[PDB]
Amino acid sequence: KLKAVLFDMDGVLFNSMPYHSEAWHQVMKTHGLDLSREEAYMHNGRTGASTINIVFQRELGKEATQEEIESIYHEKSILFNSYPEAERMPGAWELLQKVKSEGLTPMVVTGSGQLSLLERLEHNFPGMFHKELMVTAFDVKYGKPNPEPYLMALKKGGLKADEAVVIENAPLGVEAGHKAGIFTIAVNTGPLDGQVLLDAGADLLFPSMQTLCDSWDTIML
Numbered sequence: 341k342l343k344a345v346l347f348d349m350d351g352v353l354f355n356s357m358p359y360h361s362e363a364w365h366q367v368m369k370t371h372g373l374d375l376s377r378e379e380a381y382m383h384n385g386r387t388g389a390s391t392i393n394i395v396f397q398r399e400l401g402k403e404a405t406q407e408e409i410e411s412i413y414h415e416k417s418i419l420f421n422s423y424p425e426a427e428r429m430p431g432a433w434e435l436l437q438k439v440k441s442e443g444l445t446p447m448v449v450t451g452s453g454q455l456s457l458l459e460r461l462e463h464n465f466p467g468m469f470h471k472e473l474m475v476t477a478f479d480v481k482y483g484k485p486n487p488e489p490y491l492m493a494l495k496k497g498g499l500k501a502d503e504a505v506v507i508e509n510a511p512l513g514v515e516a517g518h519k520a521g522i523f524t525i526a527v528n529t530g531p532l533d534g535q536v537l538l539d540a541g542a543d544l545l546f547p548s549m550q551t552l553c554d555s556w557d558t559i560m561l
């Protein structure tokens with residue numbers, strides 16, 4: 341039945357979460373706001389704009405202005421890009437090769453608008469992905485945990501929800517995939533408790549991308 345595999349990017353394809361969590365923590369700290377690196381991890385999947393708005397609501401009891409969102413998004417992007425560029429998540433490439441060999445369509449579904457990562461997908465995973473078979477922050481009105489990005493990915497691939505599988509690392513993205521009615525595999529690549537991923541609606545849970553890759557052939561859909 342399976343036709344397509346819908347990969348989240350940060351913490352699934354790229355090992356970018358230490359950087360994302362560090363940059364969110366530091367930039368918020370610069371603005372007088374306390375957001376731990378673990379709390380930044382818990383926001384993974386959101387668009388940058390949604391993250392900024394929700395942190396302001398939670399910490400200052402008020403919405404971020406459009407100007408605050410833009411300033412903070414840029415400051416965070418610049419700090420992120422100041423680090424040596426993020427490397428592949430171990431297991432991603434090997435899994436992608438397995439997926440492509442069995443005739444499935446790889447897709448990206450991401451809350452990222454980070455062009456330094458998006459423009460590196462082809463060089464890191466050659467021959468796997470296509471811009472018209474991707475959903476990024478540039479495509480959505482509401483991102484994860486709303487199912488809108490995953491629903492859009494189904495449409496882009498001409499797929500029904502039962503013809504896809506989602507691979508996610510973050511509770512909000514797991515929630516989005518599950519709520520789009522798609523079978524969702526959680527991969528626990530960060531410091532969170534796996535139970536948070538299962539609680540978010542993940543149909544299956546693996547401790548790493550490599551362990552998911554090692555087990556893929558024995559998964560049946």
Ligand SMILES: [Ca+2]
Nearest residue numbers: 348350351510
């Ligand atoms: Ca992610």
Ligand SMILES: [Cl-]
Nearest residue numbers: 416417420454
């Ligand atoms: Cl960024």
